[PDB]
Amino acid sequence: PNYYLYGTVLTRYGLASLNHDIRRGNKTILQKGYWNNGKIHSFVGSSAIRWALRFYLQKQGYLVNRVWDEEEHINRLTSEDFDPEKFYDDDIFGFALLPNQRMGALGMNMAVSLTPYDGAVKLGAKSGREKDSTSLHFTEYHATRYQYYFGIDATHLKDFSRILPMIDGIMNLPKVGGSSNIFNYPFCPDSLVFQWTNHFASYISYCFEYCDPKSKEAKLSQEFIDEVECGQIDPSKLWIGGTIVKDLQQLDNFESSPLNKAHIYRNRNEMIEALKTVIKRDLGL
Amino acid sequence: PNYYLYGTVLTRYGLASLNHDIRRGNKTILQKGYWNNGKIHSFVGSSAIRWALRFYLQKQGYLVNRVWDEEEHINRLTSEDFDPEKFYDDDIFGFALLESTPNQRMGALGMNMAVSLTPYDGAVKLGAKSGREKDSTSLHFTEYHATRYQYYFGIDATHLKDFSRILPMIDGIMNLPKVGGSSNIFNYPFCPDSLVFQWTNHFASYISYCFEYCDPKSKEAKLSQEFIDEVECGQIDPSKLWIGGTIVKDLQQLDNFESSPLNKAHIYRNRNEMIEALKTVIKRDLGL
Amino acid sequence: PNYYLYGTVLTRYGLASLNHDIRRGNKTILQKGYWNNGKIHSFVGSSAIRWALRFYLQKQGYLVNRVWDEEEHINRLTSEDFDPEKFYDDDIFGFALLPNQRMGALGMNMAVSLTPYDGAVKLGAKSGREKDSTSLHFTEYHATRYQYYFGIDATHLKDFSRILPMIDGIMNLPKVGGSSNIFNYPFCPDSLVFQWTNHFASYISYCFEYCDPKSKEAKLSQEFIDEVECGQIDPSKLWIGGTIVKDLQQLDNFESSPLNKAHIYRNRNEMIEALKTVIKRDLGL
Amino acid sequence: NSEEDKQYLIFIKVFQQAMKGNFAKIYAKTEEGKDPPIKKKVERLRAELNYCYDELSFKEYLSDFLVRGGLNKYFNEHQEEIALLIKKSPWQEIRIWSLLAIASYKPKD
Amino acid sequence: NSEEDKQYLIFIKVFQQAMKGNFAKIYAKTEEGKDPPIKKKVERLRAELNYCYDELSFKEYLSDFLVRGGLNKYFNEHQEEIALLIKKSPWQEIRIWSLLAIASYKPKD
Amino acid sequence: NSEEDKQYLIFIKVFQQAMKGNFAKIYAKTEEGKDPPIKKKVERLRAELNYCYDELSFKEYLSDFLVRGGLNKYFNEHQEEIALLIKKSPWQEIRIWSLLAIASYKPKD
Q1: Spatial separation of the C-alpha atoms in residues B81 and E29, rounded to whole Å
Q2: Best interface-test mutation with B: which of E35, E51, E61, E91 has the largest number of B CBs within 10 A?
Q3: Is the alpha carbon torsion for B211, B216, B221, B224 positive or negative?
Q4: For helices A163-171 and A46-59, what crossing angle results, to 10°?
Q5: What is the DSSP pairing of strand A136-140 with strand A121-125?
Q6: How far, in Å, CA of A56 to CA of B173, rounded?
Q7: Considering CB atoms only, which of B25, B32, B120 is closest to E47?
Q8: B268 forms bridges with which residues in the sheet?
Q9: How close is the nearest chain D Cα to the Cα of E45, in Å?
Q10: Angstrom distance (rounded) from CA F42 to CA F36
């Protein structure tokens, strides 16, 4: 049976300067665009998160075709002929020669800042004296939480057991490409909404929303909650974990709401263990 | 294994005009922006703290490629080719030789900008060149801020060329020199007074900014309720948590502290004892 | 070895109007702002204290570059080119021309009133008749004891022996502020907490606090005593003296406390002599 | 509409009336052929408003200012909600509203 | 045409009158043979305007500037409109309007 | 020429005069050396104009630059028209006009 794991995760609050766009003169332009309310929202490309997952696989065994040198800052291919049956990288992220080309078992969307970006510019100078063209520069940051939506087709995997390392890596994401030296932003999630269903219909994409401009309270939603109440998104297939649990359990009439009978764990590790148990049972691992 | 040392350090209360912005007019403004609840906090750049760490490494002997003159206010490179194997600063902070061994390195230290624990409301200090004669460079204003500062850092210990170089880095974080700013009139010691360190072997931290204020115009600092909930719920293994500083007294004064999982963490009121225990654990884990 | 002298200085109780804000209108606004526990405290700028120290150096016959005229009330430079080797003021306080710069060995923070500023405006009429702009006027004054924190990098001095005149000037500080004709406020210390150590870490900044928000009594903050007792702040490097000595000695279990091992002298002159002996021994003077 | 601005506006009006009463009292204070200043009175009011340092200052100040404003009809019909607006809201916002009222006071006289 | 555009234009007029008043005050302040400022006071006004973090501070400075300008008729006729416009609207937009008024105040003097 | 064309040309002249003022300020500040750079100033202006990402930031920068320019006689003669054009028009079109003015600029001989 076809099984898909859709999920929207919310990162912790902090200053993030990770997806510089093109650099415009003296400034490193944080990538941003219009979103939701017609306000400018900073973005983190999904390719950055895929690279982070690739690095997570490489750092802990998990034979991968692409090897990040981490010293020469180059990629080396163990086998020029991609073999999804052997390598986790080719199996999960796919490839393209330009053959087989795969299709990719993991689909991801660009991470979206939960808050509009006002100006958030940081000055930078190089010590003193003998000042040159590189002495003065500016860097754009952003003090919000980032939110991205992903979906992994478990059945499309060459090896079904490879879905567990993706869950572990998503919950233990390494440095997502960015100015880690100056703006160290952990991309591990503090709020999760996972759906382990068996049809290609997900209504949890970008569920988290708070607006409230400059703040970090990060309420879940009203449209997603209404979707849960109306009858679809059955709570048996819904997995909610993280700091959003504290806000969810403090809502009025929560005990009578259908959202109560969903798999809700305050501890992320416990919910991940339960979800992995369910996945292993369903996939015959 | 891949061992990472994450940590959030809280400074001491005091008038601070550490990191400034573009010259503007006669008034030197702080680096400030919206941080929480839509209020404007004052920031200290992480490049300032990195420069302070480099200066500490230079002062206490050691081999650093960049040598601060401290007399001509100039930077000299002992070797034009960066060698992370030999020099401490190249190994720790990395390098990037773009003008045209690898020419680039990611460094083992990752810092974030220091955020004032208290919102910045007013606090502009009048400054005069004095005398009876007046001129253009006579009446100036300098912004200050009476607050504690709090920053978050993370170390990829395995990424170090020499694994033993983490210990001088911890010592420098403890005995940090002056962070770039007007120390002549606003002397702000950046030595930590409360520590929340985590020596774990996975990338997740959850200890980014664990300190939050009470009575927003006060020097009192407490541990954020979100961090305490994270510790109690099961996440953040207490055996990997090192808490030290003046926050220890407030933590121990909490009700049901003994029954709380936070009691199982390594809690030392004296920062030196906590640092010694953490360094013992680090040396045991890294095979030093 | 890099040696640093850190110290927090508490002044005597009296009516003080030393540093004023922008002067226009009827009131001469005292330089005040927020401080601990969220109450308005009157401030004295560190630039005024540095000027007082330089004036002390001038009055004692030490060779300095900047000279206060005392008749024209202007600043005269003996040498247009700063020379830290020869001039005490250039060596100690540094200079900037705009080597033409020097960071200076003295770093001092702003002076903070121990007691919050409540009221106490003064009436400033000038005799009778001819009610011109020199007529009815208001002056703000504060009845409190000011406290400031300073730090000296002894090794940064061009001449190591110049630290002793700095200590003497801190002891016998000349007139600080402006309203000396009607508010004569001596800035000489009455309680001192000095630390002569070889570490960049200082835990003695603003160690004094009040027992009653409207009283002249002063007491070392419980945070400082806890810091000494826990193990931080080596007592052998701690120098405490002044009228706080009596209050420290009246404390219970003082003999068993680690604070007893610190150099505690009721007479400030004895403390200064002992500390200068230690400094001369350590710096090879 | 959205009665917060209604409270803001009648606060402005009551401030203008109170300041007018105070200028009348000053007119009573002066004597003989010296011209009673008018612009200098506004400057003095602005300087005194800027003299305050939060909470107690400027709150007792502006309450005393309104009290010395004299018989204020709109204040009489708007004692309670004006007092509530005074007790609530940040003091700097009240100062901003008072300064705007000063800047828009003149066409009464 | 349009109410918002008319309010914006006459607020520009209000700000220009305020700068006229402030510049006249500066002219009165200076004496002797020293050249009274013309352009550098405009640069000072620009520096003070850009020195503005968040809203409270900018609105405080704007109200202080308007009061220091003294007598002005455009704010006299329109109390409610400009009071609401200043109280409402993002402070950055009002700063943009103030700068636009600064760049076009000079035809008067 | 239509009225829109006239306002567009007046805006181009206003921006050119503002650039004249800014470049004169740079010349005065950087008299040292063989000659202050001119191409570098144009590249800086282009980079700063392209940095703007939304209407608010671009209009803030435009007002700041226009005021830094100086007298700007073409803005003296056309308060209402140019002010309404800046307030109303989409910021992308104003950026296009500003860059056209940059390209069609003649440095003073």
Answers
A1: 61
A2: E51
A3: negative
A4: 110
A5: antiparallel
A6: 28
A7: B25
A8: B244
A9: 19
A10: 12
